């Protein structure tokens, strides 16, 4: 459903193996800066593995860009494997990979 915060204003990357949204989840780098995030989100190219996930901390959500073009493909719940959006026409991640 929604967020679950306490004193923290950002969602932490839940590292894997809990994320049963997609298959084969496969971990990855820390390349693409935060929305002023102190750094670089957690990525999990994953099923296919020609697919990438970077994490929305404010949002609670991880968002998928393609392996190839590097075009936002969705946002999905780590919990389920049901998406949350549309593909956003307006961002590219492959300049960070």
């Amino acid at each position: 459903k929604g967020f679950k915060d306490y004193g923290h204003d950002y969602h932490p990357a839940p590292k894997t193996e809990n994320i049963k949204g997609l298959g084969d989840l496969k971990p990855g780098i820390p390349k693409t800066p935060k929305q002023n995030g102190g750094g670089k989100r957690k990525r999990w190219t994953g099923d296919k593995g020609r697919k990438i996930y970077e994490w929305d901390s404010q949002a609670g959500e991880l968002e998928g860009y393609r392996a190839s073009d590097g075009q936002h493909l969705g946002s999905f719940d780590p919990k389920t494997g049901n998406q949350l959006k549309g593909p956003d026409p307006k961002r590219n991640i492959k300049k960070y990979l």
Binding site: H8, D9, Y10, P12, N36, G37, G38, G39
Partner: protein, 124 residues
């Protein structure tokens, strides 16, 4: 500021606001945990710092930081408050005297022990 102006006016004696109202102008204050959890740090960093809301004997109720690795602090842990902010944790401007009352010292700490309350690890 002509000699006369100073004669009539005078200069402004600076005054200082105690960056820490632990009150009683004491160095420490016996508190009592009410809540204990993790707070997210400021803008540049990112962690899950350990903090504790405390009820002081000075009437006030402030939050404090618990330095070290893990802890034995719960909803009722009595504890001593030290005083010294944490430029990265909003409003958290007091530290817990790790190793006093109900606050045990850092388990398996070798380096600095004057702090962390942990004693001489007799390993002989």
């Amino acid at each position: 500021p002509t000699i006369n102006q100073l004669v009539r006016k005078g200069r402004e004696k600076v005054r200082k606001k105690s960056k820490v109202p632990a009150l009683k102008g004491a160095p420490f204050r016996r508190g009592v945990c009410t809540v204990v959890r993790t707070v997210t740090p400021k803008k540049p960093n990112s962690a899950l710092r350990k903090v504790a809301k405390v009820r002081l004997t000075s009437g006030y109720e402030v939050t404090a930081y618990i330095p070290g690795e893990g802890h034995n602090l719960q909803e009722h842990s009595v504890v001593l408050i030290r005083g010294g902010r944490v430029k990265d944790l909003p409003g958290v401007r007091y530290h817990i005297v790790r190793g006093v009352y109900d606050a045990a010292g850092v388990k398996d700490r070798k380096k600095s022990r004057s702090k962390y309350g942990t004693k001489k690890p007799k390993e002989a």
